[PDB]
Amino acid sequence: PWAEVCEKFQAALALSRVPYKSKYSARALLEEVKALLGPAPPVAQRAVRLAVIEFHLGVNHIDLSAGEEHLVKCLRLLRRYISLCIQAQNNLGILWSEREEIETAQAYLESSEALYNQYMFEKVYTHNLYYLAQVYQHLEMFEKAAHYCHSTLKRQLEHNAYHPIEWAINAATLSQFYINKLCFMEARHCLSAANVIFGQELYHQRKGEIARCWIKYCLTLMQNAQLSMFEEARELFLLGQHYVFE
């Protein structure tokens, strides 16, 4: 019996990879597998095997609020007794945020981070680290959001994957934070680095934001000089990018 349920599971997993191309025959997973796991008879293994199936059924059954009930009882089963709980908890966090109840959604995200640090996967660690930076933006804790944002852009750089529009936009907008805190010698670094990755419709207007960032940089620094009371190199540079801006 074990050989055939393994094949049925693998068939269902392959199916999930596909007018609608969805739902069809996917429900076979539930009836085919539960038909065997039911009479499972340490037997604790049955709890782990059920949790895996319940996880997939919960996520798949999203297309639907009923999916929440499936995810909760999975975590309940696991918590009452090695990385699955983390994968599932992140999903409940996002769900509630999308439902505009971010006051409580943050409770899941912050908990998952503390668990990782204290208790101890690597492939998915950066997801909650990215998402946590976002909810802080709605709570307007600007210093904390800026901190996490930087951490993800740097850590992301280790792993080979890179993108042309992701980095050019995000690295650019971060610079605005340091301009507001009058960091003349630090903000320069961000725009310079962003231009290099970019060098490696959507494909045309993507560049428009970069032009605007350099203009604000140049003007803010010069005007600072008028607080008191041979320098034109900064003015010619500004114009040199102004034509591109226009």
Residue numbers in the entry: 5 to 22, 32 to 54, 86 to 107, 111 to 128, 135 to 173, 203 to 282, 301 to 329, 389 to 405
Report text from the authors:
Kinesin-binding protein (KIFBP), which is mutated in Goldberg-Shprintzen syndrome, binds to and inhibits the catalytic motor heads of 8 of 45 kinesin superfamily members, but the mechanism remains poorly defined. KIFBP interacts directly with the motor head of Kinesin-2 (KIF3A), Kinesin-3 (KIF1A, KIF1B, KIF1C, KIF13B, and KIF14), Kinesin-8 (KIF18A), and Kinesin-12 (KIF15) family members, resulting in inhibition of motor-microtubule binding both in vitro and in cells. We show that KIFBP is a tandem repeat protein constructed of nine helix pairs that assemble into a solenoid-like structure. Collectively, our work describes the molecular mechanism of KIFBP-mediated inhibition of KIF15 and KIF18A via binding to and stabilizing a conformation of the kinesin motor head that is incompatible with microtubule binding.
To determine an atomic model of KIFBP, we used cryo-EM to determine the overall structure of KIFBP and a higher-resolution structure of the N terminus of KIFBP. Given that the resolution of 4.6 Å is not sufficient to build an atomic model, we wanted to improve the resolution of our reconstruction. To this end, we performed masking and three-dimensional (3D) classification on the N-terminal two-thirds of KIFBP to obtain a higher-resolution structure at 3.8 Å. We determined a near-atomic structure of KIFBP corresponding to ~40 of 72 kDa, using this reconstruction for de novo model building. This places the KIFBP reconstruction and model among the smallest–molecular weight macromolecules to be built de novo by cryo-EM. The relatively small size of KIFBP may be the driving factor limiting the overall resolution of KIFBP alone to ~3.8 Å instead of obtaining higher-resolution reconstructions.
